[model samples]
Target: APPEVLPTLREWQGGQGEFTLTDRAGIVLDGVRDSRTAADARRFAGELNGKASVSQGRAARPGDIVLRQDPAQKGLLGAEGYRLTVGTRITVTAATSTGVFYGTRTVLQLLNDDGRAARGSATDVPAYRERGVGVCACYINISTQWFERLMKDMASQKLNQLWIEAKVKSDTDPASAFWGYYTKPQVRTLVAMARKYHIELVPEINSPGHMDTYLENHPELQLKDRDGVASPPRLDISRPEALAYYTSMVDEALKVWDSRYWHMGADEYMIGSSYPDYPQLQAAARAKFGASATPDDLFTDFINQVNAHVKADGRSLRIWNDGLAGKNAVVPLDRDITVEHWLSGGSIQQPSSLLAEGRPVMNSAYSLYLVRGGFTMQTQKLYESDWTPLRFEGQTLTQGAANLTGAKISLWPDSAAAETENEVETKVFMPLRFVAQATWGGPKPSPTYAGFEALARKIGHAPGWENTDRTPLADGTYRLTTGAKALAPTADAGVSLVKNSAASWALTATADGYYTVRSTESGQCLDAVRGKKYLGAPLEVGAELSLANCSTTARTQRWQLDTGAGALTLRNAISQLHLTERASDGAAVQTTGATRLTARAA
Candidate 1:
């Protein structure tokens, strides 16, 4: 059978035979090379478990995988493009080291479980020059391993960047300190690891708005209202001291995050307020930009000032698009800054307009946002048919629009919707692949969702990381026990606990990383009533467990398996609650508390 390549190869031509990779196969690098290509060769060799010998000078041998950079191919294959031919031997030629690295990845993906690769040739290049995803680290605590694993996943999908929306603290000012912020050392480690997989790590610490962590501590820098009352989270950038403090924070960040792109989040400022309505800021703008200046000028001046600060650090400034439009301000936004267009309507400028204004733009459609435990991708069909890196906010640019750089799928686990970091990963898995394909120029790899899903399942999780949320229980009948009681269905279809009678159940894993707990005798599924929930500020009431006719699309019927040494816990996908048994018998299944019902095979 022919092996499938993800991001669908740009062009692939099949040949008649198979190339088996074994301990005897070697990797050869051609001509004088840079350190990056050398690293690529060595890494490819390492994947062969030290069985394949790696050498320079491109001495040809059968069954050898050869890597080389070709300047002539630059016209056809861009800096991050590659040409791969797999037959008796494998050869990958690219214009850049990163391209060579990508070629090797294609080879790795083509290898079957038996170490056999189908003979083929491919020419691949990204549709969007900068393909990435944004991780809202300000709210969730992410581990170092998890970060590395995510980079690996991104690399597999041909994605090349990660936007880490985080918070920063000042060492001298205790008031500036905030929890869950990425430390400098942690940032450095992440940067190094990201580079290992050819991924760019862009750091974003938003300003003005989303600064409650800083504002709560430092009331002195807060933006004040007409009554001299400070708007808690909004920063008063009009003050020289505040402006200096914000830029100084960027200075602190520049040292650790080793990337050419720095994101200064300038989105959603003064939410719920009309533009040009902030009197204090309007006065400041008039004072600075002369008498006719509006509050809009003040906002633009603030972002432009920060752009200058970032530029002075030898990095390009990247900002959100929500606040940069419809200003008509005297102080215009810096044209040099790259705009991340993530929103539409109500002053959010169209991406095509940004391109026309000579500002580079990247697509981050609101529809594509993956918020854990909150709004998520219920289906991939709409996005596949309607969205692309070139199109957003009712605008679509020409193919290869030089100013339109790329696109990203953003993940925001705000309001503590994601109980664990692993859940966040689960939420991002499929969406990342969808974005990867959309960003990697080409026709759809599979026409149908089911077909694409099969390929995704074959590709599976990233190389180093395993989704522990995956159910470990095999399909079989087993007695579910929580202490000495048994969970059984009542006459009215309510789920309750019984002391003596045990019910046989079947557990089946679903494609969405959930399970269906069905009764073998009754042929009914354990469902949670009123369990529909999302991640946000207010929490909802816990769902009560009940028995319903098995449903394929019932979100409440899906459960997340939390497995341990010997016991397994069933958590509802919608309610985000565990299946709990009451202390008293005949009591319906209660999900009101943290009390857990431990299920083990009896």
Candidate 2:
């Protein structure tokens, strides 16, 4: 079985007789052979043995494999190598040690399950394949172990790119301050671990505007607005101080990370409005770059300047797509600029129209940010909607926009604590697995509920993951299981309304099939039946229904009784809604607390 299938491996061997493990020859281990002392090898071997036993139910024999480092090698892998193939008369070489260690893990997994009927005797060949992946660590709140798990998982999934945000603190932190700094040694450990897993970690530090955290901490370096209130602190683009600061950060990053691509965050900056000197900067940029020098032009100029500084230091420049959206923007800096599309509001069924304008696009639409609190039907919709071509007005996307470079599902832990990792994985990652397949695999139409649900279970996701059915409406719309059903206009005639108090009314109905007590004066709709009693306070009357905003539609006025117990359940023709409480027919449903209408009727 491949490592992808069997993540954990264990082994046990007894009564060994003159057993030996050896590598082929000439190849070296990553860092264990030459540079690592005998103690290091023993420690590593002990760890391997422990893991092997835990995964395979047996301890490794003397012929077990090991990997070590070789001093002669350079680059990302350094002098690291592995041991491959173990048999009688064990002889360990640096390269063979690394290979043998990996092979041993595989062998343990194969032998662990006798029912699988895995082969025992096999000739192993050691070969290394250069693979790379990128991850954009947007913040420093992430744990180092989280990154390790991500790298390992990505490597197993054949991903090689990791774009990480280098700045530990938020943009509010000062550039000169070393608060929450990730030390050089820590970064080197991360890099080495990635190499062992055949992954590449690309480090990125924001430039220009997003550096507010650092600027705010250093008030003297803050940019002022037109009123000179010293508000909206930004990097003075023409100032040499800003350049030196960014260059220094990049220099520090390159010392730790060995990535060719560097992400220079140039997104979401309020140009002229935020800065008083924006007019002057825009004029200067326009003069330098012809008629293209608008507010956005100055922003892009700032980005290009930073890009040039980093490129001069022998690295490629990448930026967010927002900076490149303007016409004749000063984007003609370097052809190596890669644009990351982070917009989320648009239709995923269509390719990004902005991609056709030029620049390789990496899509991170907000529609696919999976949350891990619990599985919702919307989660499945988001996963299915991703990767499908955007069709606007039933027309195909422009040819230029159709050339998609790749897609990424962003995991944002906003409003979530650090302890919510499992929840995030359950709510977010499980759904993204299918999205990842869609992004990396060939483009397919939106997957059916069963299709994605089935794949989720195959990958060890909770069974019945997406068991709820999204009720399909007659108008080609879909509703969740708890959505409220709409009542037609004729149903409203069956109930008569009587005034109870100011903005309050009593709805009387003869038939008890299902009826809603609603005040057209207050635009408050409640369920009114023969048996059920409800008491409502004054309703706030407006031109339109504040919640539904569908006065002309009869479906918006209808309600149904919930079939299940617990909360007050109401259903409409189209969907079901859950009320937080059991109220009298005239009871008020306030905007806050339990009285607030919890769920809309489906």
Candidate 3:
């Protein structure tokens, strides 16, 4: 049941209905129904009122729900499309079981939430056939309950795919260091759970390097460099024997996972990664060709060979865009495969080179990437992502945004301790709602801030803590001084902290009691250096204090300001260390639990 199916024609109008059911709403199959779709209808009804409301079969009693598939109901209802109509009695109809499943989901969205009676028909053809989420619990341990709830919630929002980077199989291999993969019971039950929601679960398998735990299982699998030195984390793909292991793994996975799309995380290992494979492959290539065989030649061979296994499995495969970059990537860009565009490093950092090719690419920009040791992109920021494809010369998708296949929201946790469900609710839910709208080709948001918020609220997602906390501090001009020295985030190239409000941090409040201190001059938030969070890591006061991406939930990025009649004091919400003015030099100082500032307009 692919819930994200958008139809080709939809013109829904608001209306009211007297459809009330607590315990006695019988479900009648009008034309036809399958056990899968029928069971789903019963489950959904149970969630809304109570499980007692569903009675299978055709009895069009008052308030009885109906599920039907009409091969004859054509013209406007496209293939993989459904019609959901609610008046006094609810009726869901489609040409197939999958379509009917989508109609069932739409029924839930229309019935409740804003409490407005949803009386409209949405008939649309999916823009990106694949609407997926990148779930990497490689670092964080997601409770089984949490993961299950997440999928149900996402499905309710019409999301249909999961690109999970989890090893669900229980391992007997002793060399394995960590065994976080799911037990057989979890995996078996999860398969049934996915089918219930009509969702696809594609395993994101990574190879070569950065596979520390995996390589521990097979010591001989480690890849060596051109220097004949073995790279501890990456696998040696040059050995044809390694391909044997790769095929066996995928084969074992498919018997249970049952996914049609296979994604190999071919990212990050640029240049020296193959930097001339362990002199072993280099020798083989040189002997096979002449001294002229470059690394790309050997690398392309590995890609093509590995691709063979997936090809044999009869599944569509995809890789990250970094592995498909111009001359650096000599591998054949298989039409059977898909390419994902996660960054351009451009737009600002690196101009993205993908989507321009007629090839299908999923947008996974860093602007919306949620990871640790990085700035947390809020809800508004995620809405700003350009899911549109740029029209360029010799491209697959027209320059107008048509060729772009889809977009993927990634949750790559920074450290071993990932953001908990409570910690990253803003990160996941806020951005997720917006991406759903963009992918579904629903009406776009208005440009004005208030208008955008209005649209967001109307659509159901609330304005997050980050959006409300953009201005967390009071408007004022205050100067902090301990005796003769003033506290500042920085000292002049040769100057010291003084009573100048113009060169100091200006505190502004957004929401809660948190404030982001921005320097009036450069307009950057007074941010702590971004990196892995260690329990005993020092703040490095002399040089590490700097401006970075403003985040509301980030402890180091936010400050708490208290104001009195003539004084204002600032304290780091995280360390509880107060901003201090060192009595010795004019350098801005940090004394634990420090004191108040001297406030003045000028």
Task: Please name the candidate that would achieve the greatest TM-score relative to the true structure.
Answer: 1
Model 3, range 9-35, lDDT digits (tens) per residue?
234544544455444667776766577
Question: Between 2 and 3, whose TM-score is larger?
Answer: 3
lDDT of 1 by residue, 1-602 (tens): 23476778877788888888877777888744678788767766665444787865548688888887887788989989998888888899998888988888777777636677888887888878889988887643455666887988898778998999765545645665544455667778888888888998888878877777566767788877766777777788778877787777777777778679888888867654644445767678889888888777888888888888778778899989898667645887778989998888876677877887898888887777877557775447644474677768666676546888888888786645434455677767778888888888766777787787788879875554553647677766677776666677776777777777677678888876778889877899988654333233111334457889998856667777777756777766645456776555454453424334556554
In angstroms, give how far residue 583 of model 2 lies from its true place: 58
What are the candidates' C-alpha RMSDs?
7.5, 16.0, 12.3
lDDT-based ranking? 1, 3, 2
The total number of steric clashes, by the backbone 3 Å criterion, in model 3 comes to 31
- Higher-ranked by lDDT: 2 or 3: 3
> Candidate 1 vs candidate 2: which has greater TM-score?
1
Shift of residue 164 alpha carbon in model 2, Å:
2.0
Structural similarity to truth (TM-score) of each candidate: 0.76, 0.51, 0.67
